[PDB]
Structure 1
Amino acid sequence: SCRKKCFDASFRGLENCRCDVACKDRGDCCWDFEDTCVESTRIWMCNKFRCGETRLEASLCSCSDDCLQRKDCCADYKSVCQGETSWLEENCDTAQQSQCPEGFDLPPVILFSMDGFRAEYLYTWDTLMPNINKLKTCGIHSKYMRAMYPTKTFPNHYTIVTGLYPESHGIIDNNMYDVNLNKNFSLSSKEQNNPAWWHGQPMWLTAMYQGLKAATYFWPGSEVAINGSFPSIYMPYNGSVPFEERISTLLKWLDLPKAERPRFYTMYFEEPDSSGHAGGPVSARVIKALQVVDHAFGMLMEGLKQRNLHNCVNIILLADHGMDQTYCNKMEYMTDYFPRINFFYMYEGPAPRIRAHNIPHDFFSFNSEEIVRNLSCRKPDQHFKPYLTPDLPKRLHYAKNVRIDKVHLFVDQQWLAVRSKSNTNCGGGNHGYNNEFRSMEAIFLAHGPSFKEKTEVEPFENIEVYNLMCDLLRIQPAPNNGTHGSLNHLLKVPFYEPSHAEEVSKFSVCGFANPLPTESLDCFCPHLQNSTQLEQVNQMLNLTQEEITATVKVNLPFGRPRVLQKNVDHCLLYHREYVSGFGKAMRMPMWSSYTVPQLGDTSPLPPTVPDCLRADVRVPPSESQKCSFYLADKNITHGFLYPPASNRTSDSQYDALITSNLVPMYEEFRKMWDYFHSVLLIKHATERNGVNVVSGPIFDYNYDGHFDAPDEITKHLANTDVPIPTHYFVVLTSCKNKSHTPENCPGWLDVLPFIIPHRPTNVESCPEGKPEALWVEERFTAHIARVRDVELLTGLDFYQDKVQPVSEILQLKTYLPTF
């Protein structure tokens, strides 16, 4: 045979069999020549033909008797050649600091991304991916990780390592135009390397700035001098480098002397994304790619075990987004809606945008309003909805950036919107859609001495990973949009312990001093004829200390919302059936909290009594609204935050027909608002065994996701300083265990937050004369959000008096209900 005699022309084996290059032409090569001498230089694995081999120059890794000393063994050398158990076959054993070799005092972090790894892959094809499946079994894994919108590669890869929404880190799509720079960004141009596009601080720099070297293998942004700095080590991108070579480089880095060894690593694979596009998410090509990437990841784990690092490394395996199926018969065309399309440019596909064709000249003069108008409610079954970006659901956080064109189209599942029928980028797989579509969900797995073992966690958003990685490396994170501490339940010993945010503006008292108003405020309730009758009704607002305690216990079961705005004067208004926090400068509530019990009759609430409003004797007139403000303002009317018709006693509706419960509402919005509180709210209450409601106004006129300062609000009621909300929020809170009511809930809570836009038409719902039962609920559902989103937009902090660990409350606050 040719063992240890490769290419030796002098050798003559059994029957004079040859082991030289020219042997294959003669036909007298020994039987094992091809496997011992030729193929042994083109593979990354040891086998029976290679173990103990003589070294050859051109081998990608070695199986020689000295490969461990030279630190060039193939990953599987110890298992294949020395007969030791592989990582794959070893049982799940606990990862701890004892399993770190000398010098690995701090465990390194490996951030590993497999582009386009749909969450559903991990469960349908689990046994086809033994190495990933073992990671899933031994380590911690999430049901899925939610990406950011648009579900694209560069925006989401950069979100992962920054903890920032795309609107903040600047990479809002794989293709974009910046009118200020007057430049184009695309993955085929060198402009992608311009640091002007990349904001925030990526993870490798967070580590490097705090003394920890970072090595990146192909992460989007890693070959950019972000903030003027490259990673300690980085590789120029080339999609042709085999996955095995990338893993091999990573293992070599881990062999470096401690003085030079990185402590933060990133790895990136283009699969299963590439095969998903070619064959679709359910296809032979995807199956093959999933097997490829599982093998490459297995190579990494075997190589780590060879080095005694498999239980020392904190590894994270995730993806940037999922994958769905497109169809050429599921395409919308702009030619069907515009006779002339020459004058605008369109970023086509699952998350399209439209801008002026002649840029930069016409970028701002472009009438984005006309585009969205002319695309709204054109066909009853059209498979996309146009939006001006400030009108997009606020949970997407996709508007505050000049690179995000004002015209947006929100496209239905498995559909595409293109310019004309000349576009043929259809038929395969694609992504970019609503990050809530199950097809768009990504995987998240993790394993290491700092993570919990054999644990499944609930879904979370990829903006949270950045804080987690900083906690793993024990460094401080840059300001980001994660909620630091919401992923502590993944860690054995959290590095950061969160606390309640202390209130910034203390409340004052609006006492019940005089039962008769000093001013009528131009409000009329002729049903109340003489002062005596008025005095009786107003006395109902004058609660004993025992009655205040009683209404708080029921209607504020988790404590009052705390105000984190500075220099905001507010007082609480106590009623038997609701408790509000009244903003004196706004002259309206910042929040109103009431608990709706489960009732025997699911009857719809009749309308509020029409012609009866009066001043609130507890609030001075300078801080109260006047009913004449709304008569004076022709474009808006008044609505109620707490629904008066929900009174549970024969006269308690008077408690809600007061100026302190009024908020400015467009007529058309109030129809939607009233239908929700009259019909849908009662269904929620009976489904959840009662529900606690906290609602209030939101002002975000600069659509940056944060509560506006007074001087940022650009619309007011009549000629007053009473601001007009851009949104209203409604947060439904009940007991996760439906056996308890919201008041008597010792365990976990369950939340359903709404941030409904306050718009003067319901064009977003295309009601076309239909009854509210056919579109209101759909519209609220489309505007669900996280409590955290409500907090950011209001300056309020909820649930501080709910006895429960802070980190668990943060899980509740970052939760997104999905449908």
Structure 2
Amino acid sequence: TPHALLLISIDGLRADMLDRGITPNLSHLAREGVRARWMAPSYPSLTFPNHYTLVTGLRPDHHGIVHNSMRDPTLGGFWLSKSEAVGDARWWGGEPVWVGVENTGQHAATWSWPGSEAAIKGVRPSQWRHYQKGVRLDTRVDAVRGWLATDGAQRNRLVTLYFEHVDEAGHDHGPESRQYADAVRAVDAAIGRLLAGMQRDGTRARTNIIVVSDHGMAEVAPGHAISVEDIAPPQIATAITDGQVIGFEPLPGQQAAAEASVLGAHDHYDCWRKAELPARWQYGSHPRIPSLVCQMHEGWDALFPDKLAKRAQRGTRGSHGYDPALPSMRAVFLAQGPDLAQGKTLPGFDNVDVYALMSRLLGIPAAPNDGNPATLLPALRM
């Protein structure tokens, strides 16, 4: 029986957060195994795009999950709480690792990984569920523990686990807040409980483990929110998305007026025609990207007008969705297990490279991807 892979995502864990004495279990795991200095997200540095990149090895511009919120001529609207969009395989390009696993006759079990509620390339994971808010930490850990222990024909080569808590605390209070640290500690402790349970079950020794995040988190101090309608008035363009990556579609005949007001450099953002976006972001070819894309500067939000209003103008907050090269946007990568190196540190690298490593650990043929297989070869024991 081949070694299983447990893939854990801690949404919004910034790379430096392993070095603050608040992750005893993850810090120990890293010392035992492999740790990268950091892992850069892909553009845009948002949750759905990056989680989907992690499991496909494709940049968002290629896999089609180009934002958390999207419009498509045929498929209509997509956003995180729109279940029949999220569950519709036609949005999701490429081949996520669970599809690869199921197509070899092996099985995958996913606790709420973006894309896992659809039948991508026709193939669902063997175990999966609809993402619900506020599931307990123990509930998910105990389910994952169960999935690792299953034997017979329902043995799982791949098991995935996802935590939202650090990201949510980050948004509400900022990455330097006690609330963000409390969340980091809590998720870390939960992961410790999982590891101890795997050891009691005798699954630990035959399971490789990768812990990642999708992006980091930057502070949004009070007064750092504008209206999307300050960028372009609604009569000349529609804001398709708000937050930090702001897509605009000019109204009919208004491309010139929209461009005149939007394009170029502004006080706390910059905007480009999608074909002209900075090449380093490797973004803007996909048809689902709006005609005009603005990037807010680090620490700034642009909100739909009704949100801006109910934004209780008081305390410090947090956001991501900023330039992926920023230190604040840096994510985590660490790994440990029977097939992984011991006591090793890796240079910082791009998140498209994780897929090649996972395909090797899962015994599946690597689908074509945007990563480099050379990057994570040193993470292997041999």
Aligning the two structures, in what range does the TM-score lie when normalised by the shorter sequence?
over 0.9
* TM-score, length basis structure 2: 0.93
Match of 2:321 in 1: 432
Preserved CA contact (<8 Å) 1:334 1:341: no
Determine the C-alpha separation between the residues in 1 that align with 2:264 and 2:361: 50
Match of 1:384 in 2: 269
Preserved CA contact (<8 Å) 2:264 2:272: no
Larger Rg: 1
Once the two structures are TM-superposed, the CA of residue 337 in structure 1 deviates from its matched residue by: 5.6
Q: 1:243 to 1:422 in 2, by over 3 A?
A: closer
- Is 1:255–2:255 an aligned residue pair? no
Once the two structures are TM-superposed, the CA of residue 311 in structure 1 deviates from its matched residue by: 2.9
- Is 1:187–2:80 an aligned residue pair? yes
Determine the C-alpha separation between the residues in 2 that align with 1:166 and 1:210: 26
SS in 1 for 2:162: strand
Match of 1:345 in 2: 238
Q: 1:399 to 1:108 in 2, by over 3 A?
A: same
Preserved CA contact (<8 Å) 1:350 1:417: yes
Q: 1:165 to 1:415 in 2, by over 3 A?
A: same
- Is 1:113–2:9 an aligned residue pair? yes
Per-residue CA deviation, residues 618-666 of structure 1 (Å, 9 max, x unaligned), is xxxxxxxxxxxxxxxxxxxxxxxxxxxxxxxxxxxxxxxxxxxxxxxxx
Once the two structures are TM-superposed, the CA of residue 344 in structure 1 deviates from its matched residue by: 2.1
Per-residue CA deviation, residues 149-207 of structure 1 (Å, 9 max, x unaligned), is 111111111111111111111111110111233x1101122322122211111110011
Determine the C-alpha separation between the residues in 1 that align with 2:128 and 2:335: 23
Preserved CA contact (<8 Å) 1:139 1:452: yes
Preserved CA contact (<8 Å) 1:107 1:263: yes
Match of 1:305 in 2: 199
1:411-560 correspondence to structure 2 within 5 Å: 411-418=296-303, 423-424=308-309, 425=311, 427-493=316-382
Once the two structures are TM-superposed, the CA of residue 308 in structure 1 deviates from its matched residue by: 2.7
How many residues are matched?
376
Match of 1:404 in 2: 289
Determine the C-alpha separation between the residues in 2 that align with 1:140 and 1:205: 26
Q: 1:219 to 1:421 in 2, by over 3 A?
A: closer
Once the two structures are TM-superposed, the CA of residue 278 in structure 1 deviates from its matched residue by: 1.2
Per-residue CA deviation, residues 203-233 of structure 1 (Å, 9 max, x unaligned), is 1001111222111111111111212221111
The runs of 5 or more residues in structure 2 that have no matched partner are none
Hey, which of these two has a bigger chunk of helix by percent?
2
- Is 1:163–2:52 an aligned residue pair? no
Per-residue CA deviation, residues 243-264 of structure 1 (Å, 9 max, x unaligned), is 1111111121222223221111
Preserved CA contact (<8 Å) 2:145 2:194: yes
Counterpart AA for 2:207 = V
- Is 1:269–2:163 an aligned residue pair? yes
* TM-score, length basis structure 1: 0.44
Determine the C-alpha separation between the residues in 1 that align with 2:38 and 2:358: 18
Match of 1:229 in 2: 123
SS in 2 for 1:371: helix
Determine the C-alpha separation between the residues in 1 that align with 2:231 and 2:347: 42
Determine the C-alpha separation between the residues in 2 that align with 1:366 and 1:402: 19
Hey, which of these two has a bigger chunk of strand by percent?
2
Counterpart AA for 1:201 = E
- Of structures 1 and 2, the one scoring higher in RCO (CA 8 A, sep 6+) is 2
Match of 2:259 in 1: 372
The percent identity for this pair of structures is: 33
1:134-173 correspondence to structure 2 within 5 Å: 134-173=28-67
Match of 1:287 in 2: 181
SS in 2 for 1:429: strand
The runs of 5 or more residues in structure 1 that have no matched partner are 1-104, 494-819
SS in 1 for 2:17: helix
SS in 2 for 1:233: coil
Q: 1:313 to 1:298 in 2, by over 3 A?
A: same
Moved more, 467-476 or 234-243: 234-243
